[PDB]
């Protein structure tokens, strides 16, 4: 279908994408052909075009934007929203406007499926009409100059879900993030088994638990290693366990038992305390994504690239080059490859970036944890909420938007959140920041920039805080910055 | 007088004790926390231990000076925990959650919403407000090493002399931090039962309001409380004296906010002045009569909320000290927070607008630094700002029309885009707007945001956001913008997708061009 001279609206695009199928054909020599039009390929194309170069995107999906809108970040955020709202409803069940509190997993997945063509339509419309891009969609993509001829290739095919080499892994009722939003044709029973212990497993597991299902996470090593501050990690894990989640470390699935109809009936796992069998008809695999890869490859199948994103005229970007598999990495690697193709030699080594994951809370972190900073030899002070006292977490701070009910409810104050900054006592520089609650994720983007510039506790204290703020760092810093001899709070 | 100096109560013990003192029929004991073994003179006595006095004391003590806080409240922190910022946020949380529940009424886990008790939420606040009070007393004494006398009005004798708890204290300076009182209306029936302000709402609500609420004013307070009252299921009429939400300078952002308020059922009346509050034979409000641009209006109601500007508490102190006052009763100060009276500073809401926590705390600290010999000026402006409706509304810098009127060639980067589909598209979207983004016919509710950029310098001139989870970000973003942030530098940050503000990645989408395009 030649839609080059066809100007459809966002919602007309959404409809056409749902309908599709025919190849969507929207077409100087090409400076680069992008193999894949996800975050890396789409942003790389946008930047290359904006620089005045010629680009072509070829993707097997009939929409641009890749996994993010179809089965990754967007559905994850919808599920995390549900997890947080459901924790609130269950905590205040039968109080105020809250009714007596099992949420239908399939209805939420079906809501996502019914609405995901909105973002698809925005992607196709914005890419064609506003970003001036050429693309061929709903078509899978010869040599380092041939696909169409181009001066360079930029490989941006992403990564695929990790698999498990155990009997029963293909049983009906085993899902990953990709298949959950394509093949869920029943409502899961009362138990969920989640395999894995990092972001995807924890985010989806907290959603399943929030729907009212007994949720058992089988973690190969130790959960949430990305949270380096020990107290922050312990708060996050403690709140997950209080919600009823069961986290079993050092455990490996031995087999997924199939019933006579081919459906999951149980998971058998080895743990440090021996073998256990969990009855379930629903298993979610939250394992690491695997790059879709004469290129030199790394140990995990990632395509090897130098600091200019060049492989062994062929660049590679995004999840295809391995961790960190985040949207900032995919989009920046795509743009930087495009700039190098267009003659602007610029290196990219992702380092000292902010990070985040969802449980029933938003969990934001950057820089050093407290113990990590001390083990590196720093005199450190910490400024945190709640304070270290005999009352512990059972006090009405920290408190901000979407945490006030916890702060004021009977016996719920410990759920109002946790946060901390780690400060070098000699330089007065902020070395790390950590937050559990809501509404700080966005701030950590900009805070990390200030910290990379050399932010001190005095400079933090001298800012204008928008009370009551998700992060209390500004004013709590101001309470201590008047002393040349810094003291923790 | 309770000599508390050598008692070391926990946070929760403080919460209980403050509750007891606040409920004592005889007013309760004076809380006396003075280091009677320290021979040093007081560098400053703070009249008031709210945000300004408490932070000023903390900073002065941290610098090595001696301070003495004297407040009439049995707790530190002032209006913020007791009847201002804290209860406000509690109510705004409720307003946002209730808009969500009403939008998805009878779907997923949500109950059928086709009237929430205002009194039970206020009672919840009253039952839990001692927690913050306890932390304030505990942090101030055990962590910040502050001296204070609470549950005792201060009696200023002169510019170096103050009486408290039957004793006279001398100080090198006074720092006045008594704040402001609720604004009132000079109309017949204003003292009727059923007429409340932010202070009286959390102390005197002994009944559950009826189906209609009349809010007087267009302040942040008026809009914040109004949205909460509307969200409980009540017809809510706002009587704005001038034009609503003038603080939102960007016309597009303001229009989005107002449109969403009206979609929730709020009636916003501009150019309006209450002429009388009608009382029934029981002494309770039965109606509000107001002059509007469309003539006289009479609204039947048994519940009126006044959200007028706060009035600096300057009268007594100006008589005793001879302080120069401004037209609204604010205490006049130079840029070092010095009043007209030697060795007397004034801070916080007492010095007038802007009446914000950052202003109160920073003015307290800068006064303290000047007292301690560090000449430092404080003139607040180019600060970020926010308010609640059923959404969080965040803004800094220039609106689009304001930037053009100031002579800038500008481009804008916004979500949703200007297309035939308008707001009815699934962006912007992030935490706490995903249901709106995906729901049947609710996409327009997923928010609105815009940055304003100078087309020549590429500098970001202003930022505006309606949604959730960007308020905290605007604190740090404003600093970066005051440093001279360009669209290129913004594009080069690390975003945390899906982000409340999409500014980073959308900037990156346009930053590749020499000639910027919206
Ligand atoms: C469940 C879950 C949740 C999240 C995340 C991942 C997952 C699995 N991520 C990570 C994020 O999704 C990831 O980093 C980016 O989507 C990677 O973008 P790429 O463009 O590299 O791959 P991506 O997979 O997006 O794009 C690859 C594209 O190439 C196409 N393709 C593949 N093979 C092809 C062929 N042979 N021919 C043509 N086309 C082909 C595919 O169709 C696809 O469109 C994330 N990150 C984040 O920052 N925040 C978050 O909240 C989350 N959340
Ligand atoms: C309803 C509402 C909602 C909000 C806000 C205000 C209001 C009214 N504010 C503004 C904020 O509350 C205000 O700017 C600060 O609390 C001002 O702090 P001060 O210390 O100046 O006065 P504050 O009023 O807090 O303190 C004055 C203290 O002096 C004491 N005092 C008075 N007379 C005395 C006497 N004779 N002797 C001894 N002590 C005496 C009082 O007891 C009181 O403790 C706000 N700001 C913001 O930044 N974000 C927000 O969300 C909100 N929300
Ligand atoms: O990064 S992309 O804009 O392509 C997809 C966002 S869901
Ligand atoms: O600013 S204070 O910490 O004094 C009160 C906050 S509610
Ligand atoms: Mg707490
Ligand atoms: Mg929208």
Secondary structure (H, E, C), A399-420: CCCCCHHHHHCCCCHHHHCEEE
Q: In terms of CA atoms, which chain B residue is nearest residue A327?
A: B497
Q: Cα–Cα distance between B253 and B393 in angstroms, integer?
A: 9
Do A469 and B472 form a contact (C-beta atoms < 8 A)? yes
Q: Print burial letters for B253-268: b (CB count within 10 Å at least 16), e (below 16).
A: bbebbbebbeebebbb
What single-letter DSSP state applies at residue B6?
T
Strands, E assignment, B293-431: 295-300, 304-306, 311-312, 344-346, 385-388, 392-397, 410-415
Question: For residue A402, which of A88, A103, A29, A126 has the smallest C-alpha distance?
Answer: A88
3-state helix, strand, coil in chain A (%, to 5): 35, 20, 45
Tokens 């805080």 — which residue? A465
Pairs from B255-259 (Cβ < 8 Å, separation ≥ 24)? B256/B423, B256/B448, B256/B466, B257/B389, B257/B391, B257/B393, B257/B466
Residues in chain B, total: 518
Q: Does A82 contact chain B (CB < 8 Å)?
A: yes
Could you give phi then psi for residue A60, rounded to 5 degrees? -70, -25
Around Cβ A349, how many Cβ atoms within 10 Å?
5
3-state secondary structure of B476: helix
Residue B171 is assigned to a structural domain of this protein: yes
Q: Cα–Cα distance between B285 and B308 in angstroms, integer?
A: 18
3-state secondary structure of A379: coil
| Rounded alpha-carbon distances, angstroms, from residue B375 to A475, B371, B455 | 21, 8, 39
Which of A78, A439, A445 lies at the smallest CB-CB distance from B494?
A445
Inter-helix orientation angle B503-510/A327-341, to 10°: 10
Q: Which residues contact B186 (CB under 8 A, 6 or more apart)?
A: none
Q: B91 and B138: one domain?
A: no
Query: Which residues of A, range 393-452, sit inside 8 Å of B by Cβ?
Result: 394-397, 399-405, 407-410, 413, 438-450
User: Is residue B88 in contact with ligand 4, taking CB distance under 6 Å?
Assistant: no
Tokens encoding B402: 């304001």
Inspect the interface and report whether the beta carbons of B504 and A445 lie closer than 8 Å.
Answer: yes
What single-letter DSSP state applies at residue B459?
B
Tokens encoding A183: 């093949």
3-state secondary structure of B62: helix
Q: A398 and A301: one domain?
A: no
B80, B347, B360: which to mutate for ligand 4, most atoms within 8 A of CB? B80
**N-to-C CA span, chain B:** 66
Three-state secondary structure along B218-257?
CCHHHHHHHHHHHHCCCEEEEECCCCCCCCCCCHHHHHHH
Could you give phi then psi for residue B27, rounded to 5 degrees? 95, -25
Tokens encoding B6: 């050598």
Residue B188 is assigned to a structural domain of this protein: no
| Rounded alpha-carbon distances, angstroms, from residue B514 to A50, A150, B481 | 8, 25, 21
For ligand 1, atom 8, name the residue with the nearest CA.
A72
Tokens encoding B352: 């007038």
Question: For residue B253, which of B383, B353, B391, B382 has the smallest C-alpha distance?
Answer: B391
Q: Which residues contact B416 (CB under 8 A, 6 or more apart)?
A: B422, B423, B425, B427, B428, B448
Q: Which residues contact A399 (CB under 8 A, 6 or more apart)?
A: A406, A407, A416, A417, A468, B86, B89, B132
User: Is residue A70 in contact with ligand 3, taking CB distance under 6 Å?
Assistant: no
Q: Cα–Cα distance between A327 and A334 in angstroms, integer?
A: 10
Do B69 and B57 form a contact (C-beta atoms < 8 A)? yes
Q: How far is the alpha carbon of A11 from chain B, nearest alpha carbon, in Å? A: 7
Question: For residue A480, which of A460, A463, A453, A465 has the smallest C-alpha distance?
Answer: A460
- Report whether the peptide linkage leading into residue B498 is cis, meaning its omega lies within 30 degrees of zero: yes
Separation of CA A70 and ligand 1 centre (Å):
9
Residue B18 is assigned to a structural domain of this protein: yes
User: Is residue A69 in contact with ligand 3, taking CB distance under 6 Å?
Assistant: yes
Q: A307 and A376: one domain?
A: no
Could you give phi then psi for residue B248, rounded to 5 degrees? -90, 95
User: Is residue B51 in contact with ligand 4, taking CB distance under 6 Å?
Assistant: yes
Q: B77 and B167: one domain?
A: yes
Strands, E assignment, B42-141: 42-47, 67-70
Q: Which residues line ligand 2 (CB under 6 A)?
A: A 467; B 47-53, 70-73, 78-80, 84-85, 88, 153-154, 177-179, 198, 221, 310, 313, 348-349, 355-357, 360
Cα three-residue angle B82-B83-B84, rounded to 5 degrees: 110
Do A361 and B469 form a contact (C-beta atoms < 8 A)? no
Cα three-residue angle B255-B262-B238, rounded to 5 degrees: 100
| Rounded alpha-carbon distances, angstroms, from residue A357 to A270, A434, B338 | 27, 12, 48
Q: Cα–Cα distance between A28 and A31 in angstroms, integer?
A: 9
User: Is residue B146 in contact with ligand 4, taking CB distance under 6 Å?
Assistant: no
Residues in chain A, total: 489
For ligand 2, atom 1, name the residue with the nearest CA.
B84
What single-letter DSSP state applies at residue A126?
I
Q: Cα–Cα distance between B177 and B317 in angstroms, integer?
A: 11
Q: Which ligand has the shortest distance to the CA of A398?
A: 5
User: Is residue A433 in contact with ligand 3, taking CB distance under 6 Å?
Assistant: no
Q: Cα–Cα distance between A55 and B94 in angstroms, integer?
A: 49
Do A266 and A280 form a contact (C-beta atoms < 8 A)? yes
User: Is residue A65 in contact with ligand 3, taking CB distance under 6 Å?
Assistant: yes
Contacts of A392 in chain B (CB under 8 A): none
What single-letter DSSP state applies at residue B189?
T
Do B453 and B461 form a contact (C-beta atoms < 8 A)? yes
Residue A432 is assigned to a structural domain of this protein: yes
Do A386 and A393 form a contact (C-beta atoms < 8 A)? yes
Separation of CA B50 and ligand 2 centre (Å):
6
- Resolution in A, one decimal? 1.9
Between A and B, how many residue pairs show a Cβ–Cβ distance under 8 A?
318
Question: For residue A73, which of B493, B440, B431 has the smallest C-alpha distance?
Answer: B431
Cα three-residue angle A187-A191-A197, rounded to 5 degrees: 110
Q: Which helix (H) or strand (E) holds B260?
A: helix B251-263
**Strand-pair category, A214-218 with A191-195:** parallel
User: Is residue B81 in contact with ligand 4, taking CB distance under 6 Å?
Assistant: yes
Give the full edge-to-edge strand order of the sheet including B460-467: B385-388, B392-397, B460-467, B448-454, B410-415
Number of domains comprising chain A: 3
Residue B37 is assigned to a structural domain of this protein: yes
| Rounded alpha-carbon distances, angstroms, from residue B234 to B210, B226, B264 | 8, 10, 10
Backbone Cα Rg of chain A: 24
What single-letter DSSP state applies at residue B110?
P
HSE-CB at B307 with a 13 A cutoff on CA atoms is 25
Q: Cα–Cα distance between B24 and B31 in angstroms, integer?
A: 13
Query: Which residues of B, range 83-112, sit inside 8 Å of A by Cβ?
Result: 85-86, 89-90, 92-94, 96-98, 100-101, 108-109, 111
Helix residue spans in A342-428 (DSSP H) = 370-375, 404-408
Tokens 């740090």 — which residue? B476
Q: Cα–Cα distance between A463 and A44 in angstroms, integer?
A: 36
Do A151 and A313 form a contact (C-beta atoms < 8 A)? yes
Separation of CA A6 and ligand 6 centre (Å):
24
Do B252 and B403 form a contact (C-beta atoms < 8 A)? no
Residue A359 is assigned to a structural domain of this protein: yes
Beta bridge pairs of residue A310: A315
Residue B273 is assigned to a structural domain of this protein: yes
Residue B288 is assigned to a structural domain of this protein: yes
Around Cβ B171, how many Cβ atoms within 10 Å?
21
Q: B353 and B220: one domain?
A: no
Q: B99 and B52: one domain?
A: no
Q: How far is the alpha carbon of B186 from chain A, nearest alpha carbon, in Å? A: 31
3-state helix, strand, coil in chain B (%, to 5): 35, 25, 45
Q: Which helix (H) or strand (E) holds B90?
A: helix B85-103
Question: For residue B155, which of B146, B147, B164 has the smallest C-alpha distance?
Answer: B164
Q: A312 and A359: one domain?
A: no
Q: Cα–Cα distance between A445 and B503 in angstroms, integer?
A: 11
Inspect the interface and report whether the beta carbons of B131 and A404 lie closer than 8 Å.
Answer: no
Quote the domain boundaries for residue A213. 73-114+172-219+245-286
Contacts of B356 in chain A (CB under 8 A): 467
Q: Which residues line ligand 1 (CB under 6 A)?
A: A 35-41, 58-61, 66-68, 72-73, 76, 140-141, 156-158, 177, 200, 289, 292, 318-320, 325-327, 330; B 497
Q: Cα–Cα distance between B191 and A482 in angstroms, integer?
A: 46
**Got the DSSP string for B313-380?**
--HHHHHHHT--B-TTSPBP--TTSB-SSTTEEE-GGGG-S---HHHHHHHHHHHHHHHTT-------
Q: Which helix (H) or strand (E) holds B13?
A: helix B11-23
Q: B140 and B202: one domain?
A: no
Question: For residue A300, which of A157, A198, A179, A162 has the smallest C-alpha distance?
Answer: A162
Q: B405 and B314: one domain?
A: no
Query: Which residues of B, range 336-395, sit inside 8 Å of A by Cβ?
Result: 356-358, 361-362, 365, 368-369, 380, 383-386, 392, 394
**Strand-pair category, B161-164 with B167-176:** antiparallel
Q: B56 and B159: one domain?
A: yes
**Got the DSSP string for B300-324?**
E-S-EEE-PPPEE--HHHHHHHT--
Inspect the interface and report whether the beta carbons of B356 and A446 lie closer than 8 Å.
Answer: no
Q: Cα–Cα distance between A112 and B152 in angstroms, integer?
A: 59
Sign for the CA dihedral angle at A467, A473, A476, A482 comes to negative
Tokens encoding B288: 């509000």
Identify the residue among A18, A324, A331, A467 best suited for mutation to test binding to B, counting B beta carbons within 10 A and taking the highest.
A467
* Cα A40 from chain centre: 15
Q: Which residues contact A134 (CB under 8 A, 6 or more apart)?
A: A26, A27, A54, A55, A56, A57
Query: Which residues of B, range 53-72, sit inside 8 Å of A by Cβ?
Result: 55, 58-64
Q: B71 and B141: one domain?
A: yes
**Strand-pair category, A283-285 with A153-155:** unpaired
Tokens encoding A189: 């029973």
Q: A438 and A370: one domain?
A: yes
The helices-and-strands tally (H runs, E runs) of chain B is 16, 24
Q: Cα–Cα distance between A50 and B516 in angstroms, integer?
A: 9
* Cα A246 from chain centre: 22
Q: Which ligand has the shortest distance to the CA of A350?
A: 1
3-state secondary structure of B22: helix
Inspect the interface and report whether the beta carbons of A115 and B426 lie closer than 8 Å.
Answer: yes
3-state secondary structure of A278: strand
Q: In terms of CA atoms, which chain A residue is nearest residue B127?
A: A408
Could you give phi then psi for residue A171, rounded to 5 degrees? -60, 150
Do B390 and B229 form a contact (C-beta atoms < 8 A)? no
Inspect the interface and report whether the beta carbons of B132 and A442 lie closer than 8 Å.
Answer: no
Contacts of B477 in chain A (CB under 8 A): 446
Domain boundary among B345, B374, B403: B374
Question: For residue B396, which of B346, B461, B448, B456 has the smallest C-alpha distance?
Answer: B461
Q: Cα–Cα distance between A272 and B211 in angstroms, integer?
A: 61
Q: Cα–Cα distance between B102 and B49 in angstroms, integer?
A: 41
Helix residue spans in A96-194 (DSSP H) = 105-115, 117-125, 177-183
| Rounded alpha-carbon distances, angstroms, from residue A9 to A119, B415, B425, B436, B440 | 12, 16, 10, 20, 19
Tokens 């910027």 — which residue? B516
Q: Cα–Cα distance between A241 and A214 in angstroms, integer?
A: 11
Give the full edge-to-edge strand order of the sheet including A314-316: A24-26, A135-137, A55-59, A32-35, A153-155, A314-316
Inter-helix orientation angle A39-50/B503-510, to 10°: 40
Beta bridge pairs of residue B129: none
Q: Which helix (H) or strand (E) holds A355?
A: strand A355-358
For ligand 2, atom 36, name the residue with the nearest CA.
B153
Q: Cα–Cα distance between B382 and B16 in angstroms, integer?
A: 41
Q: Cα–Cα distance between B344 and B318 in angstroms, integer?
A: 11
């Amino acid at each position: 279908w030649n839609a080059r001279n066809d100007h459809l609206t966002i919602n007309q695009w959404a409809t056409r994408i749902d309908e599709i199928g025919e190849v969507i054909y929207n077409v100087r020599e090409y400076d680069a052909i992008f193999i894949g039009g996800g975050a890396a390929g789409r942003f790389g194309s946008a930047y290359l075009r904006a620089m005045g170069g010629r680009q072509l995107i070829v993707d097997r999906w009939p929409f641009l934007g890749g996994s993010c809108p179809h089965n990754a970040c967007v559905p994850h955020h919808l599920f995390s929203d549900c997890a947080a709202e459901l924790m609130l409803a269950r905590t205040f069940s039968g109080q105020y406007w809250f009714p007596d509190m099992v949420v239908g997993i399939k209805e939420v997945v079906d809501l996502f499926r019914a609405g995901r063509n909105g973002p698809h339509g925005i992607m196709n419309f914005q890419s064609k009409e506003q970003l001036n891009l050429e693309y061929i969609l709903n078509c899978p993509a010869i040599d380092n100059h041939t696909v169409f001829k181009a001066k360079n290739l930029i490989l941006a095919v992403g990564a695929g879900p990790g698999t498990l080499d155990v009997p029963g892994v293909n049983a009906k009722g085993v899902f990953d993030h990709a298949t959950l939003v394509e093949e869920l044709d029943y409502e899961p029973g009362s138990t969920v088994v989640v395999v894995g212990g990092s972001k995807t497993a924890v985010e989806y597991g907290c959603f399943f638990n929030a729907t009212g299902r007994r949720t058992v996470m089988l973690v190969r090593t130790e959960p949430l290693k990305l949270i380096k501050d020990n107290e922050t990690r312990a708060y996050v894990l403690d709140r997950m366990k209080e919600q009823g989640m069961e986290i079993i470390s050092g455990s490996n699935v031995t087999r997924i038992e199939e019933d006579a109809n081919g459906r999951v009936q149980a998971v058998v796992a080895m743990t440090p305390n021996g073998e256990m069998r969990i009855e379930t008809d629903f298993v979610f695999l939250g394992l690491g994504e695997q790059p879709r890869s004469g290129l030199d490859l790394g140990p995990k199948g990632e395509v090897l690239v130098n600091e200019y994103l060049q492989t062994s005229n062929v660049y590679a970007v995004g999840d295809l080059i391995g961790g960190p598999m985040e949207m900032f990495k995919a989009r920046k690697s795509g743009c930087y490859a495009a700039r190098n193709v267009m003659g602007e030699k610029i290196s990219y080594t992702p380092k000292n970036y902010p990070d985040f994951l969802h449980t029933h809370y938003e969990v934001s972190f950057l820089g050093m944890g407290e113990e990590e900073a001390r083990a590196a030899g720093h005199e450190i002070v910490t400024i945190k909420m709640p304070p270290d006292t005999e009352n512990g977490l059972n006090v009405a701070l920290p408190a901000s938007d979407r945490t006030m009910l916890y702060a004021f409810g009977k016996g719920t104050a410990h759920m109002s959140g946790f946060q901390k900054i780690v400060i070098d006592a000699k330089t007065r520089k902020v070395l790390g920041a950590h937050h559990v609650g809501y509404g700080a994720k966005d701030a950590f983007q900009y805070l990390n920039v200030l910290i990379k510039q050399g932010l001190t506790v005095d400079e933090l204290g001298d800012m204008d805080e928008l009370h009551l703020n998700p992060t209390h760092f500004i004013q709590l810093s101001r309470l201590r910055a008047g002393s040349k001899n810094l003291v923790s709070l």
